[PDB]
Amino acid sequence: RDEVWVVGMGIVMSLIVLAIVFGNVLVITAIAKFERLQTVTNYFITSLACADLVMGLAVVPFGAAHILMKMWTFGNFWCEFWTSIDVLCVTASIWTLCVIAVDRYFAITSPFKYQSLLTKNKARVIILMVWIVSGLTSFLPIQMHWYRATHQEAINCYAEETCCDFFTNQAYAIASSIVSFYVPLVIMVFVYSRVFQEAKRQLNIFEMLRIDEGLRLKIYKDTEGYYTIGIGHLLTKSPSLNAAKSELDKAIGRNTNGVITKDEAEKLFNQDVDAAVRGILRNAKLKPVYDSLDAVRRAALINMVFQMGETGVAGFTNSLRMLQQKRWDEAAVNLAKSRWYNQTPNRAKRVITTFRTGTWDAYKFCLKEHKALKTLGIIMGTFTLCWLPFFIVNIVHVIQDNLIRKEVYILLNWIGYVNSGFNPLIYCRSPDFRIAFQELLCL
Numbered sequence: 001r002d003e004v005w006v007v008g009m010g011i012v013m014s015l016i017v018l019a020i021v022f023g024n025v026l027v028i029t030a031i032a033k034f035e036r037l038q039t040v041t042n043y044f045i046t047s048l049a050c051a052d053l054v055m056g057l058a059v060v061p062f063g064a065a066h067i068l069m070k071m072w073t074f075g076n077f078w079c080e081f082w083t084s085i086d087v088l089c090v091t092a093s094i095w096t097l098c099v100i101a102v103d104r105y106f107a108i109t110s111p112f113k114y115q116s117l118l119t120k121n122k123a124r125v126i127i128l129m130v131w132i133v134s135g136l137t138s139f140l141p142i143q144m145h146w147y148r149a150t151h152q153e154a155i156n157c158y159a160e161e162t163c164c165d166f167f168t169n170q171a172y173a174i175a176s177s178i179v180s181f182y183v184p185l186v187i188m189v190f191v192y193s194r195v196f197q198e199a200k201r202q203l204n205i206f207e208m209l210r211i212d213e214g215l216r217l218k219i220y221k222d223t224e225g226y227y228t229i230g231i232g233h234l235l236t237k238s239p240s241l242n243a244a245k246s247e248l249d250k251a252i253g254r255n256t257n258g259v260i261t262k263d264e265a266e267k268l269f270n271q272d273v274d275a276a277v278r279g280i281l282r283n284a285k286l287k288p289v290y291d292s293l294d295a296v297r298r299a300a301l302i303n304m305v306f307q308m309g310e311t312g313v314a315g316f317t318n319s320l321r322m323l324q325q326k327r328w329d330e331a332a333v334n335l336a337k338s339r340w341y342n343q344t345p346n347r348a349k350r351v352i353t354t355f356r357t358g359t360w361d362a363y364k365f366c367l368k369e370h371k372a373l374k375t376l377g378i379i380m381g382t383f384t385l386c387w388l389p390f391f392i393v394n395i396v397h398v399i400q401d402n403l404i405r406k407e408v409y410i411l412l413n414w415i416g417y418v419n420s421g422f423n424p425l426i427y428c429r430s431p432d433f434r435i436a437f438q439e440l441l442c443l
């Protein structure tokens, strides 16, 4: 209990409280003030950040006071109430994460793909419902004293206003643990593993080419040096801006002035990728290699025709022969031994991998909408990494009470507590939240 331990642990607990509060009001302020961040996914994130803000203000400081003082100095009424809020916050967090997982599944399986089927009205209704049901399953078994144990060590701690050690009967510690944590966790891990499976299997040429070519609504110059716009649409071979601006207006049918809209860029991208497949079926050297290939490897060939041209890809006489004979790794080395690989290495390696593996693993989490699914997977993933050891030691204590000490029980609970401050830092992955944070912090 040395002076450097109590002050040392006192400082880190104080910093943990500050990092949780600051970080979460930052997230709540960002979604409430910036319209770009006003989505149904972010509505569940503000629900998650609220529980985290309640954690850092109402549970973590009183928990820190219980460790340093080695006793409870807030009475028996605030003891039960503090514990009830604590349980409510963890239940609401995992259930909102479960709701996000389900919402993301219904979105990816819908033709909208990355848009939720829920409106903002029903999303709010879903959010207050998790808090009403969580509030009922968290406050009622504690206020009614259904959680209470019948052994001497327990009953004496309830009577003492100095004690607030969570003593429970084996029935509450199993029922509340599976209903408030294990059931939403199992559903979340099973449902969110499917959203990752869907995102990868549903990858097509349109998403693949948006990864490789990108999207720039303004007229720019590519790696080759020629003028390009939208998703890899070459305008002219002429090194003249007005020459490229003239051929731009002729493609849309209006005075563009060099600026294009998403509707126009997508329309131009659709006819471009259609011209790429049209050229393959007309070219005598590319037509049989296309028929021999599979749906995913066909996209890799279309991609090559989109970038280099129909006659360009027909030059790989050896590589095309290898693709028909289905000698993927032997095709890869010849494709590596090219000017195309030297000029665009990050793009070529992905297309070459797609020919080898015959999967979308090279284009794994490359799309902006996929990064958003990865970020949400990290939010869910760290939560279970932080809470699972505490919830495992909780369902082990019921079978054998002497197997684990009280010192390791609080430590694993605090591993779950520090999670409440990680979520805001994980949102820095999104550029929308990054731009929001910088503006609110005035940097």
Ligand SMILES: CC(C)CCC[C@@H](C)[C@H]1CC[C@H]2[C@@H]3CC=C4C[C@@H](O)CC[C@]4(C)[C@H]3CC[C@]12C
Pocket (backbone or CB within 6 Å): 043, 044, 046, 047, 050, 051, 054, 085, 124, 127, 128, 131
């Ligand atoms: C211990 C108890 C009293 C604290 C509970 C606090 C309640 C009132 C808070 C915590 C989380 C909150 C929700 C967080 C998310 C949203 C989405 C937002 O776009 C509209 C409001 C709404 C729906 C909030 C309403 C109020 C809410 C349910």
Ligand SMILES: CC(C)(C)NC[C@H](O)COc1nsnc1N1CCOCC1
Pocket (backbone or CB within 6 Å): 083, 086, 087, 088, 090, 091, 166, 172, 173, 176, 177, 180, 181, 394, 413, 416
């Ligand atoms: C033990 C103490 C200090 C009250 N912390 C509670 C934990 O942070 C999490 O509590 C829970 N949230 S949802 N389900 C639970 N539990 C964990 C404890 O045993 C009963 C059910």
